Amino acid sequence: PFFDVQKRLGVDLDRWMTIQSAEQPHKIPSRCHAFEKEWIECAHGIGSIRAEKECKIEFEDFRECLLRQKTMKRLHAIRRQREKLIKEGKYTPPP
Amino acid sequence: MWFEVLPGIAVMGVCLFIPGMATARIHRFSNGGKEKRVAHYPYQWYLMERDRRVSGVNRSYVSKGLENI
Amino acid sequence: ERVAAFLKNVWAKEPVLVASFAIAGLAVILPTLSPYTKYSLMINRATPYNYPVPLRDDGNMPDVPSHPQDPQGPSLEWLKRL
Amino acid sequence: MSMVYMNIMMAFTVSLVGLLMYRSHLMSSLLCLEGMMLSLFVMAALTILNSHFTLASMMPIILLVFAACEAALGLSLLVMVSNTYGTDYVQNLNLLQ
Amino acid sequence: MNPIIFIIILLTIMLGTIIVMISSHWLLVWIGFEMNMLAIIPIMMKNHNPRATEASTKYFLTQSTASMLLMMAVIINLMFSGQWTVMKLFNPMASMLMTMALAMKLGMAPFHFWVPEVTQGIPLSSGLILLTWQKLAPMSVLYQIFPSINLNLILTLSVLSILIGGWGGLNQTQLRKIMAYSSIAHMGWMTAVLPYNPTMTLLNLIIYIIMTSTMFTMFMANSTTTTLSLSHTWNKTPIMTVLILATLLSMGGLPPLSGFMPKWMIIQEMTKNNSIILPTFMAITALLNLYFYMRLTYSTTLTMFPSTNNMKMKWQFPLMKKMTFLPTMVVLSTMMLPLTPMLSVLE
Amino acid sequence: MMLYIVFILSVIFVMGFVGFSSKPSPIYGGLGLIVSGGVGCGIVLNFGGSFLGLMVFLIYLGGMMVVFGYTTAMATEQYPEIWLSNKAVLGAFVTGLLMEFFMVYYVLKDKEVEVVFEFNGLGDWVIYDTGDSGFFSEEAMGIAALYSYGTWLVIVTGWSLLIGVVVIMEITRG
Amino acid sequence: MFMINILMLIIPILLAVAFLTLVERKVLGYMQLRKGPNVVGPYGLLQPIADAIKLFIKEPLRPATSSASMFILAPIMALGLALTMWIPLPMPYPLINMNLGVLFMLAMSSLAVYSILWSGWASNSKYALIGALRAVAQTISYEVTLAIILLSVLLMSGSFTLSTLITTQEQMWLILPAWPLAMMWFISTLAETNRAPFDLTEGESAAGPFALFFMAEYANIIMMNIFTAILFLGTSHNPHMPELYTINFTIKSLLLTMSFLWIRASYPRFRYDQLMHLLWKNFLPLTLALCMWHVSLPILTSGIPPQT
Amino acid sequence: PGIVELPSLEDLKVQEVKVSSSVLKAAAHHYGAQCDKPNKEFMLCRWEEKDPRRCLEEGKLVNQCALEFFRQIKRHCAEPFTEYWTCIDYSGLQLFRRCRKQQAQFDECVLDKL
Amino acid sequence: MNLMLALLTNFTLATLLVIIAFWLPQLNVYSARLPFSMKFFLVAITFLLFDLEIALLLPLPWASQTANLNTMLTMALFLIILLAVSLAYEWTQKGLEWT
Amino acid sequence: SMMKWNRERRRLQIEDFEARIALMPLLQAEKDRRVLQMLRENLEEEATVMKDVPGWKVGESVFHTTRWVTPMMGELYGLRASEEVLSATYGFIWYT
């Protein structure tokens, strides 16, 4: 915050909703809890300039869990190769 | 006399009785003579899908007991 | 005395608003005076929505039961008799 | 990204272009403003729901509440404009040139 | 307006700004802007005339459009980082939208068209809030997201604002339009230095607020809204003409007045970063502002314009407006250069 | 196929936006927004957002859009101009539909399209959560948490709504 | 099978509405020392069929409308929404078991006002649009208390599922702990449906289209009274004999519906400003105070219901 | 990135508990009391390893204890138990409170015999 | 699917009844400001703002399950009181009048 | 009367929840095998379809970390019949 009244007064006005790995009702976890947790812990206290380079691996994994762009790209590749092979009659899906 | 109002009230009452009676009996017909399963939360849906697999015929309302153990 | 003759006037002229303010006043005050308010928090706590993950036994946990029917652990005997 | 994000992002853009390409009725621009909010609500709800980020579930409601209160203010200004000139045409709002 | 309601509405304006400045959550930042806008409309409408209605409508549409773009940036950021923390953004497209949203709120060119019109259409006291307090919230966000801001975009917005603000003011005779274009030019200096040293943004912001509040207060004291109305002040309150003279020269950045300090400190920061052409261009372009400040000094203080016979009646009555904090503000507007090193308190 | 219901709804969602964004008479522009709102609820329902979806009907459609139509009847229009009778509206309407169709035609054929940004076309079902068997609505748990976690959110939201009443009365008094 | 079930709900509703018109005429007749329909069929039993056929072969004389689209749209929305209100009703089992059925009905009932608004636009008459706007203002106003009252009751029930209202009232009708709410609820439903003494659209003021608006409005009358019975006069459900529930539940709904007729026969009409005052200055203050009370009451008595 | 190790198809085979949810519902309270030890060992493993591949052996011992649990009902209390879970199975919500009479018969049988 | 089938049937039947109503053998061979009060606009806006506060109150049946009952009840009563306050403000400011 | 009945209803809910808790270990064990069987089956199909695609490793992870990652729907039903995918995806939401 521009004026960090919350930290200085020790009162939680809105930090409880800022991240998805914080405490949640009935301990319901978010789908990317472990990825966000790992990236936050790597990047804690070193500053965003350092974190952008030194925690790059965690952030890349976390972004993969969030949007699943690589995973979809791999499935789209296997789907392409099947419905192609199926036309050349070279594949038979199992029962 | 006022009891000549009853025949129209009886017809309207019969009309409003059919929906509840029809739904209850259609549910029994479609669910092996039992109440239709209520699955409002994911846990209840998970058991209903598990029942479908266990049933062996792909119907969640066909029950398997100790005979299948 | 001055307030007593004030209430008589509103009761005669605005009984609907007098009831509203009284009902709303009771809603704000009674929970602090009721002796059952403490059981509302207890019952809500006792309802187990999520799984109770067991602890790893280190040998220094005399207050943690080894089995659900063991005598250690929170009891709901108070709730049954409630 | 997923397919839906394509169309939801497109709907926000369409309503933004609609808002920035005024015609005559001031009401027509308030509708495009409320269309932008609709797509924001849908985009946020989808993201929050899909990620299972539980405490954020109230966020779309808060967005709806403030936006509707914001739309109420817009309608109040429209009626005051309409009480002055007899229509809500935006070409009447040119005294301050 | 009922005096109690007016106070409550003023506190809601302040509270909306404060929420923006103390929030660590983007949703609460957006809520702050919404609350602030909700409470500012009644004070623009408080004299109930068609020009006030037009100003409030033009203000509502501009701020509402900007707040929608701000929320869009927040949601894009949520998609690509999964969090709401108020800080750098994690998507370049979100950064451009948020930057453009805040430029729209600040009235920077080329999103500047509303500022002269809205200021002209509302009372002087409302214009004082519009051109001073309302800059705090957008600037406090820019102060926190600047690491992710595109450098070319922010400097382009700054250069255009200095050019547009300077050129726009030359053609103005209305005092509220002059102040509006002065504001646009000064936002340009604040954002030019933001990528290099945010502390100098705050310094320029604070000093700008003090001088702008001084000018608006002195305009209110005499109920002047036009150049010619202001040219009668010499035959009523001669002291006020001297204060107006000094404040205008300060706003022109002339040494040894307080308004030199922000331009001076900003030039220093950009030169330290091997930026020479930009500060030089900005300083030269700022002479456009100095020209139409000097014009006001000519008609107000350094010459005596013709008067009217009925003015003699005004000689017999005292100045009864509050003029709150004017003696303090005018002294800080002009005499702070010897205390320049005190800018480190903002660090 | 039914697996693409969300994508189908999002396609209709866009057309509704083109409907009122081309800005016919605000009577029809309001109708286009009502249909988009209903479709918008349908999209949110299929992602597990039962409560959030019904708020669109109750608040957005049953509340805000009723007042929009109510105000239109008073201060904007009473009779509508023939839909598409204006060249600009029709041109914008036709322009949007064709842009939408070209987006949909290519994504369906390739299972992925590149409209400025990269988008997949396999289906929205592929990103869904796989394991779930809690005995509650997580979406309902989060909204209920507003009263135990969001004390701050309630205060500022409550204050703003009270101010909305005060402000609107000031604006309309004259 | 499900398609049969839908029809065995839609069709009986339309017949129930048709014979409600007969029952209202005969009940009003006898409270007026007369008989009402008793010639067209025995005891007037064919009077509704005669009326329906007559209305549908009448000249559909519509003067030119402002917009054809909204002229057709208004009655389709009215009748479609009215039939939709019935699909979550537990009688004792619902056609569609919704986890948020109560919220679904509130959402669908808030759209009903569009049919009124669109009728005003399509009338191509300045004076008919004003009457439509006066009707909308009355409707949305009384929507406020209906929502809050319903919320207060659900705080003793614990969920938005309609069938849970049956469980909540296993031992006792909710009318007993909530008769102040039931009173205002019942009057609110009258004002909501433009029923006397709130029938100001008629007081202030063809062929098939008219018959369709009428049918939708009378279907809402029956449904509101079914909802009142479920909300406040919970019928006990025996899962092995569901028809016993249906019989008792139907009787309560008929008596509640007949009380709408009873009230029509008994009172003069409110002035428009007076029914606005009845809500904003009377019902709403009490409703707000009672909403506070019912939020506090389960907590201070340790009587919070289960969430499922 | 590497290859996701996965156990072989025959490393996952086991005798499944092929009974319906109303059977498990009816037996749940005695099941939880009787099979607590392997059950809690398995759940400790899952929350500690956070990897289903790492608890497959303990997951198998969960099935064995459950099959043995049900083979023991089938061997002593088959007819009281069938009446009970058939009453549970009739309810759309599978309510316990509708079947207290049949529950007592099953409860008495297991207590007397086991 | 069931619910969509229900909705389709209800509105499809409504559409059919409306068209057959409009069609039958007849056996024949031959944009401005309404003069409508600002008070009615204020009713609509007032409904809207209250409708938004009812949206905030709808979660209350679920919220009563929390273990943070002290906070839950205080915020629940706070929201209703402020709703009552806005009603009181309108009332005293002659906003619920028709004369 | 409502306090007495709601208190009893809370006790009935606890008894119902405890029945679920007793069964969750057994259900969790079954779910693990089902997911792992489905992933092992998809791997065998992948090893055949992409048997020699230039440079395609089989079963390669997209994540740098070796930590177990819960698969999403596309990774489990990505190659299975549509009706199973509809039921697995939208079945609960549509049951209503």
Ligand SMILES: CCCCCCCCCCCCCCCCCC(=O)OC[C@H](COP(=O)(O)OCCN)OC(=O)CCCCCCCCCCCCCCCCC
């Ligand atoms: C120390 C570090 C900081 C260094 C930076 C410089 C700081 C100085 C700026 C301070 C701020 C400006 C305040 C100046 C005070 C002016 C008061 C004054 O000298 O008298 C004004 C004079 C009196 O008028 P009045 O009182 O109404 O009636 C007279 C009857 N006896 O009014 C008149 O009679 C009007 C006379 C006609 C107008 C003549 C205008 C030319 C003189 C202007 C001088 C001020 C210029 C300030 C610019 C800075 C100068 C370096």
Ligand SMILES: CCCCCCCCCCCCO[C@@H]1O[C@H](CO)[C@@H](O[C@H]2O[C@H](CO)[C@@H](O)[C@H](O)[C@H]2O)[C@H](O)[C@H]1O
């Ligand atoms: C216009 C009116 C402006 C008035 C402004 C008044 C300020 C009000 C401050 C509200 C925030 C008070 O402080 C905050 O309260 C809430 C509830 O009590 C607490 O929150 C508590 O509830 C839930 C329960 O887990 C969690 O958020 C947290 O675990 C717990 O601490 C915060 O720990 C506390 O930091």
Ligand SMILES: CCCCCCCCCCCCO[C@@H]1O[C@H](CO)[C@@H](O[C@H]2O[C@H](CO)[C@@H](O)[C@H](O)[C@H]2O)[C@H](O)[C@H]1O
């Ligand atoms: C008991 C606590 C329970 C929580 C209650 C919730 C708070 C609600 C706050 C509502 C405040 C309304 O306050 C109310 O204001 C009006 C002002 O006109 C006062 O009423 C006064 O004004 C009216 C004008 O209409 C006069 O007719 C009347 O003779 C006069 O007494 C009331 O005496 C007071 O009751």
Ligand SMILES: CCCCCCCCCCCCO[C@@H]1O[C@H](CO)[C@@H](O[C@H]2O[C@H](CO)[C@@H](O)[C@H](O)[C@H]2O)[C@H](O)[C@H]1O
């Ligand atoms: C304009 C703003 C208006 C805001 C109005 C706010 C009204 C709030 C009124 C009641 C708020 C607290 O309401 C109630 O107070 C009592 C005071 O001890 C609390 O305490 C009570 O419950 C706790 C729970 O264990 C017990 O331990 C305690 O012995 C008992 O006294 C309750 O837990 C709380 O539910």
Ligand SMILES: CCCCCCCCCCCCO[C@@H]1O[C@H](CO)[C@@H](O[C@H]2O[C@H](CO)[C@@H](O)[C@H](O)[C@H]2O)[C@H](O)[C@H]1O
């Ligand atoms: C005023 C007009 C408003 C229109 C708003 C339209 C919605 C805009 C949606 C933006 C969301 C997508 O935003 C875009 O996504 C892709 C997907 O990784 C990102 O990724 C892309 O850029 C960076 C560049 O190194 C890399 O990730 C990668 O090389 C490339 O794929 C973009 O950096 C990001 O800018």
Ligand SMILES: CCCCCCCCCCCCO[C@@H]1O[C@H](CO)[C@@H](O[C@H]2O[C@H](CO)[C@@H](O)[C@H](O)[C@H]2O)[C@H](O)[C@H]1O
């Ligand atoms: C509910 C199902 C009922 C199924 C019954 C089906 C019966 C179909 C036969 C319909 C016969 C209608 O008969 C006819 O109705 C129309 C209604 O406008 C009347 O009116 C028609 O003719 C008159 C002149 O004669 C015209 O001025 C008028 O414009 C035209 O509408 C006719 O005067 C009447 O002769």
Ligand SMILES: N=C(N)NC(=N)NCCc1ccc(I)c(Cl)c1
């Ligand atoms: N309102 C009444 N109670 N009757 C009445 N006087 N007119 C309405 C008669 C009517 C209207 C539509 C249909 I379909 C049917 Cl069958 C009967």
